[PDB]
Structure formats: structure tokens, C-alpha cells
Ligand binder design. Structure first.
Ligand code: ADP
Ligand code: ADP
Ligand code: MG
Ligand code: MG
Lengths: 51, 472, 187, 506
């Protein structure tokens, strides 16, 4: 039973991986570029200023 | 203004440093780098050009970045010398391996010096009563000369070195220096503990031996240059102190192995069977720096690890010609039961002269060699043709040779736990008399096993009596 | 010491030329001469093939040199010497490379450090200006030098930027970040 | 689940902090790749043997630092990495997790958890390349290692801290004797005295994943996985993984050793490690030294096996017993790699193929198998009985060869020959059968003391079982006395003599 539960955890983990990659593919289609570009441009500006 | 350089290339144990000035350090100069864990020393090997030179790392190039500051000492690697080094473990860079504080040596001689000239060569034929039957019989050891202990892996080379140390250094009287070149650190620890127990090393008092360890865990440059460091210690002890130096260089073949090590990455074209092209020359200066001069003497005791028990390998073959006394520890005798394994034929010394060891000793040695050679020649005859299918004289010679080979076995005090018999010692005159009596056939009726693991002829007759009593 | 380290025979001549120009303090003249020579090479595509030819003889290489030298009547007092050194060393098939490393040496010392702001899409020019000022004001290889960042539209980046400047790139691309969570998700 | 979410959030916050801190502190552009070695530009001030992060995700490490280009060996498949990939450096020397959490866990060369049992909890990170302890930190090998083989491995022991070699051809029993030793260590690591526990660590380098899976299955079948680390690099991953896995196993071994604990490490089949280094050096622009092998193979074996040592009481009295394994071709112990490893070790254990095919499952040749702990670093009960039995057995072999050479006072008429043949037949063992030290003295004592003259070679196999049953059924007094004392005294010697000549009639 404990190894069956370990296999259950492993299959839950791989199903989570499939969900993550599916959501990544979904993000590859939706317009999610300009806002994040501005966000990490500000992040890199703050990184340069912090030093 | 100290000479400063910047590291450009780090290839394993090979480090390339460039100096932004015309003042380029000379070859063999010591280049120190301040590492977070301590100090790393580099020895210049070649001048590659463009104000860049090639160096050999004395320590592992841990965390070596390109452009790290390098400082040139100005001269070769200098190690502490004098009576202070006695009873102290000496590293390749001279730093005290032991944790008994620093070394307050008055001088720090460089490890790269010219060998003594031909004029200052005080050759001698003095005998050395080591206490081992075979070496005292067939290849007598020369006091103040160079000593060889050729042998393969697992043949007793380190055991023979330890036994020789125990036998001689205690009664040597003069100073000595043990030099570990590319050997196991555990064996060095055992040797250090044994000489501490026997009184040769006295931490709280006076010690007759200086310890230099370049153990086989260390980088190739350290293995190559520890022989030079110990040689410098021996040279200072011989010249300045004027004492008979009992130099015990352990695994001298590791020097040539490290030379080939650095040679592959130095750009040198490999020599035969992959050795370094400059093996002959560099080992020539190293070995010729050991010699008997007018100031004193260095009795170098070297053990050579022959690769694959192949005596035709260039390094042991040239060490044969670059050495006075040879003691080959053949594996074929080591596994035969006579673990002393000193092959009674290729183990030759220049002391085998009628005017040196005496006419009787020379005759005895020649006759025992004759008997053993008859045994080797008739090995196949006994093997498949048949021992009984042989002449009476040939059978008698074969039996005498077998008895002699069994007699060549001698228990060692350092190998008491190994052989299980106390390591008794035998004097040269006793060995000569016993072997002369044996060659006369006075002990033919005695079984061959009586000569097994015994010392003098008294031990032989005692073992014969005890086996007769126990067997009845 | 030359401003930057150059390696290989294609670049040893460049740093030698830079060292020679440093003695005469005529780095600008040598630079302009090299640009004129490579412009002449681009003017005649056959001439570029002439340079790259390794079988072309010593007299023919010398004739090519006099051809490229007689125009402009002299490129520079030293770069013609470098050209004839290349001829006697048979290195006319690398002159574009030597000019490349000499130019790299030029921006190394003249305060013209170059950067590669690579992105999946062409960089918006309003956002382009924001990148320039921040890195110029920052201390990343900053000792009073200008900056020449240029957008590098590549498909390897999923999105975002890799601000590259003097052996310094920031792992700010969103592609590397989404992958970095994947291995730990697969634990 | 709940843990992946918070773990991911924390680690990506740390990732953003790293990206926003000091840029990345150095980078590089890939110039070449292939066979697990990658050239890269940049990295002007990169540390030596330093881990590097690749954009694709493959790990790396710096064996070579040329002017301009940097020699990086690829830790994993080289398929992912391409030209122009940014190569971030981790800022530290190559490390591996070390600690008590690695017990019961299988990890790769880099120390990442590969068994899928969860994250690795390590007290710290130790460099894969660590200088071996010096002369004074090292201590003489005196504490025995219970091999549990009921063979020459007992009469000539291993002891705590020895690098006892296991030479022989493939499928001769090297892995077999290694696993028997690991299983036998359970009897001592299942207690509470940490001074006698031997926390094993396996190095399954150059081993197929099916074989290592069967090995770990056998380990946990005998409840041996609780104390054994299976840090290894299988044949699936790249050559640098194979090259580094034994060194990181050595790092774990020193962590156990530097903490005062005793650990047994078995470098299983270092030959693939040597040829993996060959693969690195061929395309890393290091010319080979001898016999197509780069010269530094001897040096790497030196640094890797000399780290295995017995620490002194000042350093914690820890032990790092090593069991190196080499796969020789055709029994050629005179080949290069043999010569170096036989010269790198403290004795060897020969396993010829002919003895395995003859029927002797241990298949160990007594004649050449030597060690530096003869009648030392043993229990004491076995060391007094057979402190010099190896030389006697070698002489028996020589005389038996001599006996067949010519018909003389030899063969069965030779007491030495009879004793040697009976002892050689005695020294046998079945796999997965760890035998304790207490049930080993009476057999060897009967062999050495000439009590097996009238037992016959064919009946010695039954005599072993009968004698062991005799002790474990109706003579457990002296057996338990030997086990608890760890030595046979005059009383114990007399009792064992009583038992042996009482049972000689049966
Ligand atoms: N007199 C002896 N009796 C029994 N065994 C010996 C004797 N001398 C040496 N040995 C064995 O030989 C081995 C020494 O091997 P050695 O030749 O020193 O190897 P290496 O030359 O590689 O150091 C020891 O392990 C020891 O067991
Ligand atoms: N009593 C035994 N002792 C040792 N090995 C045995 C025994 N009985 C069977 N074997 C077989 O011997 C093999 C040992 O091979 P092994 O030594 O692991 O190969 P390698 O030397 O390549 O690692 C095992 O696969 C096993 O099936
Ligand atoms: Mg040796
Ligand atoms: Mg195996």
C-alpha cells in the first residue's frame, strides 16, 4: 500500500507536469507579451540601479 | 620591485603565466600564488614565448582563475636544511607537513643544483652488512654507493625498504633522510610510526632521520620534485655536516612517471612506449647528484617499481645502468614462496670481486649462481620431460639449487606480522660459511622445507630437528 | 598592454598593428585605412576572392597589395607594412578577420562597448531607449565608456531579453524561467 | 500538491534574486560541443574545476582553461546544448551533497536525487576533488572490516581504511564479493555502536541501469539499503558523469570519515571511469600519454583512492575503507590500467575466470592476492589461526605444480600438499550468504593445524556445514566467546581444539 501511494504521488506529479506544459502552450497563444516585457524591463532597471 | 605575473592558462597540473615586463623569471623558478586555502607554488618549466612561460603546479590547482596574481621568488624552490629537518616531515615546497610548528633552519638551499664534478668523485668498495642472506651473498651492498630494489607490484619492495631501514639506520650512526616519491600515504604513516617506536625518530630529542614525503596523493609536480628536495637534504647532510647519509628514496620510478605526466601536457613528443623524451637526461642529473664525494657520502637506497614486471621498460632499464647495486624482486619467486623474491641472477652489484668480498665469498656466490642457473635451465626438463628422467649429477644440482632457493627466504622484523616468523638477522660471514657448507653437500639429506623461513645454518638444523620430532 | 586579448594567427596581426599604432599614436589613421581597404574589397567581389585565394603566388599577392594601395595613394604608414608582412606570410585570406579584431580593439579602448539585447520580437524603440540609459548609467563595465546595444531578433528566445554586455548576460528571459520551474516540478 | 506550489514559488523568488544580483557574474558563448566536452568563449575569470549553468539546462565543469576558450565537459546529454548558448557559471567549485540524508537514497554524480524518493537532505556540500589526508591525519589500519566471505578475504583481511583491490575478469565475482561485504556489514550497522557501524556507499559507474536496479533491489531485500548510498553514473549518461561519480562518492566517504564515522566504499569497475576520462581528454585537446591513455589516469586514480584512509584519533578516528574493482581482459594483470591500480591500492583480490568456471564461486587465487594487513587489522581470532596461511597455500600450489612435474615423494604423501588442497577447498562461499566471523575460525583452524588429513577433498564441503552446525547447535559456548571477545585466548584455543578433534571423527 505504501508503494502504491508512492506510485500515486508519482502519477499525480507527472499529471501536474502535463497540466503545466499545457498551460505553457496556452500562454504561448494568448496576448501575454507586452505587460511581462514592461514588468521585467522594470525589473532589470531596478537590478542595475541596486548595484 | 618583486616580479609579478598573471595566470593565462590552467591545464590540470600545468599552469601558464604571462609577465607584463621584460624581466622574465628563469626556468625552475618558484612562483607563489596566494590561494584562499593557502599558498600555491609553481615551478617554471619552459619559456613558451610572448612573455609567457609554462609552470608545474606544486599543489592542486584548486580554484585557479585566469589572471590571478603570481609572485616570483627569484630562485628555485628552497626547502629548509640542517639538523632542524631531522625528525620533521618535509613537504615538496619545504613547508612542514607535520603540525609541530615551523622549521628554524639556518639556510634554505635550492632544490636545483649542479651535480658534483668528476674530480670530486670518491669511489669506494666498502661493504655493507645489511643482514639479509641473499643480498649479502650475491649482490653485496656498497657503503656510500647507490642501491637498487627493483620489483613489481606486491613483491615486497616497501617491505624490503623498511627492513633495510630497521637493519641499518639504527646502527648507521650518521645522519639519514627518507624520501617518499609517489608512494601510498598509509605506508608512509606506518613507516613514520615504526621509526618513532624504534627510537630512530625522537620528537622531544635528537633524530637521526629527516622525513621528506611527496606522497602518491600529491599532484605530479610534487611527486617529481620531492625526490629533488630529499636529494638536496642528503647533499647538505653529506657536504656541510660531513656525515654518511643513508638516503632512502622510495619509489624513484615515480619521478620518471611524473616527468612523463608533465611531458604529455608540456607539448613534448612522447618517447618510446609513451615516456617523456627527456627521461634519460633529467633522471641523469637527479641520480648523478647522488654520489660519494670527498666531503662525505650519500648511500641512496632506491626502490624501482617496474611496470608489468617488464625489465625492458625504458625507465627501469636505464636505472639499471645508472645504479651500482641492483636487487631485482621478481614476482616469479615472490609467488613461489620465497617472498624476499630477490632473483639470484639479475641482482648484481659492483662489489662482486675477489679483492672486495674475498676469494671464498666470490667462489661461494659463483657456485650458488651456477646451481640456480642449472635449476632454471632444467625447469622445463623437470616440468614435462620428468625429474626422474635425469642424470644423477643434474638431479643433485637441481636439489641443491632448490635447497638454496628455500634458504634464500629470510623472515623480516617489519614483516613479522606478514610471514609469521620473528625477523632474525644473519651476518655476512655466517651466510658465507653456511652456503659454503650447503654447497659441499653436508645437508643433502635434510629436507628442502627445513631451509624455509630460517636464518643461519643453526636455524636450519633446528628446523630440521623440530620437523623430525613433530613428524617422527 | 593591448586593450583586449586576441588569440590565434587571425588576430595576432591585429594586436601587433594596434601595438604599432600605439607607439605612433595613430590608431585612428590605421582604423580608417582598414575600413577603406575592406570597403574596396566589398566594392569588387572578385578582389575579395583574390584575397581568399591561398594558391595565389607571392608576386600575385604583392600585385594585389599594390592594387589596393595605389588607390587612396597610401592607406597608412604602417598598415601597408602589415599588408606586405601578410603577403610574405601568406595571410591575405584573413584580412577581413584581421580588420574585425582591429575594430574590436578600437571599440575596446575608444569607449564603444557593444551589447546584444536579443529578443523574440523586434525591440520597440521607446523600450529600446530605456535599455540604453539604464545600462549606460550602471556600473557594468563602467569607467566612462559609451554603449552600442543592438537588438538581435532570434528564435531561440521564447520571449524577453538577454542583456549582454562585456561577458555579462542577465537570465531575465521568460523562456529560461518557465523551464527552470519544470525540473523541480519533475522531482 | 501543496509542497510543489510553495517550493516553486520560493525557488523562483531565489531565481529572480539571483538574476537581479551581480548580473550573472560571468557568461560565455558555446564554440563547440561533442561527446560530452564543450568549448566556450567568455568566462575570462572562471574558476578551475567550476560548475557552469547552460541555457539548455545541462551542467558542466572546467577541466581546461585555455586563453580565450574554456574546456567544459558536459554533465549530461549534449543534444540539448547548441552553438551560441549562454553559459552561466555557478560561482563555486564542483560540489556534491554530503550528509546522513543520502542514506537510503540513490543519486547521480552531481548528487541530484535520481531514485525519485524525494529531495536530498545534506548537512553540507563537499568538493568532488578533495586533497587526500596527510601522513599524520592518516592512521595505521587496525580496525577490522568483516568481509563475511569465509575465504581468503578472512585469513588475509581488509580492515578499516584499506583500499583492498578486487582484480579479475568480468563476471568473476567482484560485484558479488562487494555485495556480500555490504550485506555482512548489516550485522554491525544494525546496532548502536557507531564506532563499529560501516555505512556503505556503492559506486555503480559504467553499470547498466537494469543491473544497478537489480542490485538495489537485492540490497533492500536484505534490508541493506538503509545504510548504503548508490551514488553512481550508469551507462546511459555521458562520460563526464562516469568520470565524476566515483569522486563524489569519495566526497561522501570523506564526509562520513571526517565526522568520526566508518564508511565502506566500493569503486565498482573503475575501468569505465578511466575510459570516460579518455573520452573527455580525446576531444578536450589533452594528448594521450601511454597506450592511447592520457597520462593523468594514474594521477586521478591516486587522488581518488588515496582519499580513502583511516583517520587518527585527533581527526576523529574515522575510516574510509575502499574496495576498488577493475575489469581486466583475459586475466591480463600486466596491462596498463591493471599495473596502475595494483600499484595504487593496498593489496588485491584476484578473481580469475578459470576458477569461476571450475566451480569455486569466490574464484579467488590465493597465490597473487596479497594485502598490507597480513595478521593485522583483523578480528584477532582469525589472525592467530591464519596469520601466514597465504604463504603456505602459495607454497602448496607451487609444490603441487612441482608434484605433477615429476613422480617423487609428493602428491598425497606430502602433508603440506594435503593441507593446502584441503584449505583451498575450504575457502569457498555462496553468494548472498554473509557468514559472521565467529563461524569462520574453526574451519580455518582445522585446516591450518593439520586436522583435515583424513577428511578427503570431496567431503570437505559437507564437513564445513557439519562443523558449523556442530558449533551453532551444541558448542555455542566457545563460538559466542570468540564472537564477544573478538579473539581466541588459551582457554578459547583449548576449547576449539577440543571441538575440532571431537568432531574430526565424524
Ligand atoms: N617477508 C614477507 N613475508 C610475507 N609477505 C610479504 C613479505 N614481504 C612482503 N610481503 C607482502 O608483499 C606486499 C608488499 O608489496 P610491495 O612489493 O611493497 O608492493 P609495491 O612495490 O607496489 O609497494 C605486502 O602486502 C606483504 O603482504
Ligand atoms: N555462489 C555464487 N557466488 C558468486 N556469483 C554467483 C554465485 N552463483 C551465481 N553467481 C553468478 O555470478 C555472477 C557474478 O557476476 P559479477 O561479478 O556481478 O559480474 P562483474 O564482475 O562484471 O560485476 C552473478 O550474475 C551471479 O548470477
Ligand atoms: Mg612500492
Ligand atoms: Mg558488475
Amino acid at each position: 500500500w505504501v508503494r502504491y501511494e508512492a506510485s500515486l504521488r508519482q502519477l499525480e506529479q507527472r499529471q501536474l507536469a502535463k497540466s503545466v506544459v499545457s498551460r505553457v502552450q496556452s500562454e504561448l497563444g494568448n496576448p501575454k507579451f507586452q505587460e511581462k516585457v514592461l514588468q521585467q524591463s522594470i525589473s532589470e532597471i531596478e537590478q542595475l540601479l541596486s548595484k | 620591485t618583486p616580479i609579478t605575473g598573471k595566470v593565462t592558462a590552467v591545464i590540470g597540473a600545468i599552469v601558464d603565466v604571462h609577465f607584463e615586463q621584460s624581466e622574465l623569471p628563469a626556468i625552475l623558478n618558484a612562483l607563489e600564488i596566494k590561494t584562499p586555502q593557502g599558498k600555491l607554488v609553481l615551478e617554471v618549466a619552459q619559456h613558451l614565448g610572448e612573455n609567457t612561460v609554462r609552470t608545474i603546479a606544486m599543489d592542486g590547482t584548486e580554484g585557479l582563475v585566469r589572471g590571478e596574481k603570481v609572485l616570483d621568488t627569484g630562485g628555485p624552490i628552497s626547502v629548509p636544511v640542517g639538523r632542524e629537518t631531522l625528525g620533521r616531515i618535509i613537504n615538496v615546497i619545504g613547508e612542514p607537513i607535520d603540525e609541530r610548528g615551523p622549521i628554524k633552519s639556518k639556510l634554505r638551499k635550492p632544490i636545483h643544483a649542479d651535480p658534483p664534478s668528476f674530480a670530486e668523485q670518491s669511489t669506494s668498495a666498502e661493504i655493507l652488512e645489511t643482514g639479509i642472506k641473499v643480498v649479502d651473498l650475491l649482490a653485496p651492498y656498497a657503503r656510500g654507493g647507490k642501491i637498487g630494489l627493483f620489483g613489481g607490484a606486491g613483491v615486497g619492495k616497501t617491505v624490503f625498504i623498511q627492513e633495510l631501514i630497521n637493519n641499518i639506520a639504527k646502527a648507521h650512526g650518521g645522519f639519514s633522510v627518507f624520501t617518499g616519491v609517489g608512494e601510498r600515504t598509509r605506508e608512509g604513516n606506518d613507516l613514520y610510526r615504526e621509526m618513532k617506536e624504534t627510537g630512530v625518530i625522537n620528537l622531544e630529542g635528537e633524530s637521526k632521520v629527516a622525513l621528506v614525503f611527496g606522497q602518491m596523493n600529491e599532484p605530479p609536480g610534487a611527486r617529481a620534485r620531492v625526490a629533488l628536495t630529499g636529494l638536496t637534504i642528503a647533499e647538505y647532510f653529506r657536504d656541510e655536516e660531513g656525515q654518511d647519509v643513508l638516503l632512502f628514496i622510495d619509489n624513484i620510478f615515480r619521478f620518471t612517471q611524473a616527468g612523463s605526466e608533465v611531458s604529455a601536457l608540456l607539448g613534448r613528443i612522447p618517447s618510446a612506449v609513451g615516456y617523456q623524451p627527456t627521461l634519460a637526461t633529467d633522471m641523469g642529473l637527479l641520480q648523478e647528484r647522488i654520489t660519494t664525494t670527498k666531503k662525505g657520502s650519500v648511500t641512496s637506497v632506491q626502490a624501482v617499481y617496474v611496470p608489468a614486471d617488464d625489465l625492458t621498460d625504458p625507465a627501469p632499464a636505464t636505472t639499471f645502468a645508472h645504479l651500482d647495486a641492483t636487487t631485482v624482486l621478481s614476482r616469479g619467486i615472490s609467488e613461489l614462496g620465497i617472498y624476499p623474491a630477490v632473483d639470484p641472477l639479475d641482482s648484481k652489484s659492483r662489489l662482486l670481486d675477489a679483492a672486495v668480498v674475498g676469494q671464498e665469498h666470490y667462489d661461494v656466490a659463483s657456485k650458488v649462481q651456477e646451481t640456480l642457473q642449472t635449476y632454471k635451465s632444467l625447469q622445463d626438463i623437470i616440468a614435462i620431460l620428468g625429474m626422474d628422467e635425469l642424470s644423477e649429477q643434474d638431479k643433485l644440482t637441481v636439489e641443491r639449487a632448490r635447497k638454496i632457493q628455500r634458504f634464500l627466504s629470510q623472515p623480516f622484523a617489519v614483516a613479522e606480522v606478514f610471514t609469521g616468523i620473528p625477523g632474525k638477522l644473519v651476518r655476512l660471514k655466517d651466510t658465507v660459511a653456511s652456503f659454503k657448507a650447503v654447497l659441499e653437500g653436508k645437508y643433502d639429506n635434510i629436507p628442502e622445507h627445513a631451509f624455509y623461513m630460517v636464518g643461519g645454518i643453526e636455524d636450519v638444523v633446528a628446523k630440521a630437528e623440530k620437523l623430525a620430532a613433530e613428524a617422527n | 598592454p593591448p586593450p583586449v586579448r586576441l588569440f590565434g594567427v587571425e588576430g595576432t596581426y591585429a594586436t601587433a598593428l594596434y601595438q604599432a599604432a600605439a607607439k605612433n599614436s595613430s590608431i585612428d589613421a590605421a582604423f580608417q585605412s582598414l575600413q577603406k581597404v575592406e570597403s574596396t574589397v566589398k566594392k569588387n567581389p572578385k578582389l575579395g576572392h583574390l584575397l581568399l585565394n591561398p594558391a595565389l603566388s607571392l608576386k600575385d599577392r604583392n600585385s594585389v597589395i599594390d592594387a589596393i594601395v595605389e588607390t587612396h595613394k597610401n592607406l597608412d604608414g604602417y598598415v601597408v607594412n602589415l599588408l606586405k608582412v601578410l603577403s610574405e606570410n601568406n595571410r591575405l585570406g584573413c584580412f577581413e578577420k584581421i580588420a574585425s579584431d582591429f575594430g574590436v580593439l578600437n571599440d575596446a579602448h575608444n569607449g564603444l562597448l557593444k551589447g546584444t539585447v536579443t529578443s523574440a520580437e523586434p525591440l520597440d524603440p521607446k523600450s529600446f531607449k530605456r535599455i540604453e540609459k539604464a545600462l549606460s548609467a550602471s556600473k557594468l563595465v563602467g569607467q566612462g565608456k559609451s554603449l552600442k546595444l543592438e537588438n538581435v531578433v532570434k528564435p531561440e528566445i521564447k520571449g524577453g531579453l538577454l542583456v549582454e554586455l562585456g561577458d555579462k548576460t542577465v537570465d531575465l528571459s521568460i523562456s529560461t524561467k518557465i523551464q527552470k520551474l519544470i525540473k523541480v516540478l519533475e522531482d | 500538491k501543496a509542497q510543489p506550489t510553495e517550493v516553486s514559488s520560493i525557488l523562483e523568488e531565489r531565481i529572480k534574486g539571483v538574476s537581479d544580483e551581480a548580473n550573472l557574474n560571468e557568461t560565455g558563448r558555446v564554440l563547440a560541443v561533442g561527446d560530452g566536452i564543450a568549448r566556450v568563449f567568455g568566462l575570462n575569470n572562471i574558476q578551475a574545476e567550476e560548475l557552469v549553468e547552460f541555457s539548455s539546462g545541462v551542467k558542466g565543469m572546467a577541466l581546461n582553461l585555455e586563453p580565450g576558450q574554456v574546456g567544459i565537459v558536459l554533465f549530461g546529454s549534449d543534444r540539448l546544448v547548441k552553438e551560441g548558448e549562454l553559459v552561466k557559471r555557478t560561482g563555486n567549485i564542483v560540489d556534491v551533497p554530503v550528509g546522513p540524508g543520502l542514506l537510503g537514497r540513490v543519486v547521480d554524480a552531481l548528487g541530484n536525487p535520481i531514485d525519485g524518493k524525494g529531495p536530498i537532505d545534506a548537512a553540507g556540500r563537499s568538493r568532488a576533488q578533495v586533497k587526500a589526508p596527510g601522513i599524520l591525519p592518516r592512521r595505521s589500519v587496525h580496525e577490522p572490516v568483516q568481509t563475511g566471505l569465509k575465504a581468503v578475504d578472512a585469513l588475509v583481511p581488509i580492515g578499516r581504511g584499506q583500499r583492498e583491490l578486487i582484480i579479475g575478469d568480468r563476471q568473476t565475482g567482484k560485484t558479488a564479493v562487494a555485495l556480500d561485504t555490504i550485506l555482512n556489514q548489516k550485522r554491525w550497522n544494525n546496532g548502536s555502536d557507531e564506532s563499529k557501524k560501516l555505512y556503505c556507499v556503492y559506486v555503480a559507474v559504467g553499470q547498466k541501469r537494469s543491473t544497478v536496479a537489480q542490485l538495489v533491489q537485492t540490497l533492500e531485500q536484505h534490508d541493506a539499503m538503509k545504510y548504503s548510498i548508490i551514488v553512481a553514473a550508469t551507462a546511459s549518461e555521458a562520460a563526464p558523469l562516469q568520470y565524476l561519480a566515483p569522486f563524489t562518492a569519495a566526497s561522501i566517504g570523506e564526509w562520513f570519515r571526517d565526522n568520526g564515522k566508518h564508511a565502506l566504499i566500493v569503486y565498482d569497475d573503475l575501468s569505465k571511469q578511466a575510459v570516460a576520462y579518455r573520452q573527455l581528454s580525446l576531444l578536450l585537446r589533452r594528448p594521450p600519454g601511454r597506450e592511447a591513455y592520457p597520462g593523468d589516469v594514474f594521477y586521478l586514480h591516486s587522488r581518488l583512492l588515496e582519499r580513502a584512509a583511516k583517520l587518527s584519533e585527533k581527526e576523529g578516528s574515522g575510516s574510509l575503507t575502499a574496495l576498488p574493482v577493475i575489469e581486466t581482459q583475459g586475466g591480463d594483470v600486466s596491462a596498463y590500467i591493471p599495473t596502475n591500480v595494483i600499484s595504487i591500492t593496498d593489496g588485491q583480490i584476484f578473481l580469475e575466470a578459470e576458477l569461476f568456471y571450475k566451480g569455486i564461486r569466490p574464484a579467488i587465487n590465493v597465490g597473487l592476492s596479497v594485502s598490507r594487513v597480513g595478521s593485522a587489522a583483523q578480528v584477532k581470532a582469525l589472525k592467530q589461526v591464519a596469520g601466514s596461511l597465504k604463504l603456505f597455500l602459495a607454497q602448496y600450489r607451487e609444490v603441487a605444480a612441482f608434484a605433477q612435474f615429476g613422480s617423487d615423494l609428493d602428491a598425497s604423501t606430502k602433508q603440506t600438499l594435503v593441507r593446502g588442497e584441503r584449505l583451498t577447498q575450504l575457502l569457498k562461499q555462496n553468494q548472498y550468504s554473509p557468514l559472521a566471523t565467529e563461524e569462520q575460525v574453526p574451519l580455518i583452524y582445522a585446516g591450518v593445524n593439520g586436522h583435515l588429513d583424513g577428511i578427503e577433498l570431496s567431503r570437505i564441503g559437507e564437513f564445513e556445514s557439519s562443523f558449523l552446525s556442530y558449533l551453532k547447535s551444541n558448542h555455542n559456548e566457545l563460538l559466542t566467546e570468540i564472537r564477544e571477545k573478538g579473539e581466541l585466548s588459551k582457554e578459547l584455543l583449548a576449547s576449539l581444539k577440543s571441538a575440532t578433534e571431537s568432531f574430526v571423527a565424524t
